[PDB]
Amino acid sequence: TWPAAVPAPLPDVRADSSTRMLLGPVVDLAVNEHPEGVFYRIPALATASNGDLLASYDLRPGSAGDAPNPNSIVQRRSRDNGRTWGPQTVIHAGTPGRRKVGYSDPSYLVDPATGRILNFHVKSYDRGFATSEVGTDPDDRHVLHAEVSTSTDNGHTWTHRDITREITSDPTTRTRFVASGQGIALLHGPHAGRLIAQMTVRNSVGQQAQSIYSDDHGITWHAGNPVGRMMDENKVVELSDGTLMLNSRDAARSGRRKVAYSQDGGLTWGPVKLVDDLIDPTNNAQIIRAYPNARAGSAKARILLFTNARNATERVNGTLSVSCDDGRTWVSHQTYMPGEVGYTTAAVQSDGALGVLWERDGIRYSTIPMGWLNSVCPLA
């Protein structure tokens, strides 16, 4: 039986001997048709409190179908910053058939204050995101449910529970999913300690972005006020002063990401605008702090990293973009993976390099050493 996780700070980026951004070796974490008729999609990557690197993704049986295909959440672990990977383990396995159950679209949320790791994902019965109906009864086969899996042992074992009712304060909310990739723990400002992740919802107003957050270190979850129209998978990041930012996929296909700001820890958001700098084909993406422990007023606290498919209509050219100024401008875009990438995510690793995952005939992993960062955002 594995030991209890202990509290430990999230990693910050560290300087390498590199002077240019160069992808390391590519690792095939899961390959479609290995085994026959099984497909892999929807990546999540995190550094656990013990420094292990954890990758999660869907196992999709039969085809790469979204919910309500009876998918499973699975995981692989590296204890050497991505050089080698243990065998796949199951976070929560779906069930085929007339009473099918599916677990799909994982995101991790690591709480450095406790060491606990959360993995959010849908729980489906007969309906997916688009066809789910109003209702929150846990056995309702017409509802797309929200589950969170908790691990207290750095991701070796999991316990599961349905959070749909507690995050549904508006009874017209007919569907929801937490965006795959990773949520955050807040470290700065009045809401330090809060754990927060973003969802997409449909309700009487439209298709909105909505934060869910916990102030008791993941025992109970509450939804903030929803925001925006034609929103979709969106990710939240804590800026240098503790203002939050959400960066969203645009369901209206503008060819750009969308952005909004919260001054109250995700309870309310302001107006949603396009980010003209961030070309995107209506696809998932991940934004993170490079130095999440750095304090307000430091240059390091203002540096954000963003991964997506930098293209207006096709999910190609996995690209790392850097902002030095709390997301106000994006001064550097560099494609680390030409061609098909689908969903990407990135996470700071324990060694201070960046891990990336993308989708091409399954899930692929690589590393970007980060010594070149100071040449784009001076660090002093």
Ligand X SMILES: CC(=O)N[C@H]1[C@H]([C@H](O)[C@H](O)CO)OC(C(=O)O)=C[C@@H]1O
129 is a contact residue toward ligand X (CB under 6 A): yes
Distance of closest approach, residue 339 Cβ to ligand X, in angstroms = 17
Count of residues interacting with ligand X (CB under 6 A): 12
Site mask, ligand X, residues 32-51, x = CB under 6 A? Answer: ----------x---------
Q: Which two tokens stand for residue 261?
A: 């700001």
Residues ≥6 apart with Cβ < 8 Å to 242: 186, 188, 189, 190, 191, 192, 265, 296
CA distance 330 to 268: 25
CA distance 90 to 356: 21
Give SS3 for 118. strand
Name the maximum alpha-carbon separation found in the chain. Answer: 60
Nearest residue (CB) to ligand X, 144 versus 370? 144
Of the candidate residues 122, 227, 260, 301, the single one contacting ligand X (CB under 6 A)? 122
Catalytic residue among 58, 126, 233, 280: 233
Do residues 40 and 106 lie in contact, with contact meaning Cβ atoms separated by under 8 Å?
no
36 is catalytic: no
Nearest residue (CB) to ligand X, 104 versus 307? 104
Residue nearest to ligand X (CB): 129
- β-pairing verdict for 181-182 and 102-110: parallel
- Residue 202, CB half-sphere, CA atoms under 13 Å: how many? 14
Catalytic residue among 66, 126, 238, 250: 66
Nearest residue (CB) to ligand X, 217 versus 360? 360
Of the candidate residues 52, 126, 147, 233, the single one contacting ligand X (CB under 6 A)? 233
Distance of closest approach, residue 298 Cβ to ligand X, in angstroms = 35
Instruction: Locate the DSSP E strands across 204-254.
Output: 207-214, 222-223, 234-238, 244-248
Q: Candidates 74-82, 121-129, 317-325, 346-354: pick the segment binding ligand X (CB under 6 A).
A: 121-129
CA distance 12 to 373: 12
Residues 145-184 that bind ligand X (CB under 6 A): 177
Q: Which two tokens stand for residue 121?
A: 């994902």
CA distance 91 to 204: 33
Q: Candidates 122-130, 155-163, 240-248, 301-309: pick the segment binding ligand X (CB under 6 A).
A: 122-130
Residues 51-110 that bind ligand X (CB under 6 A): 66-67, 104-105
233 is catalytic: yes
58 is catalytic: no
Q: Which residues bind ligand X (CB under 6 A)?
A: 42, 66-67, 104-105, 122, 128-129, 177, 232-233, 251
Residues with a catalytic annotation lie at 66, 233, 343
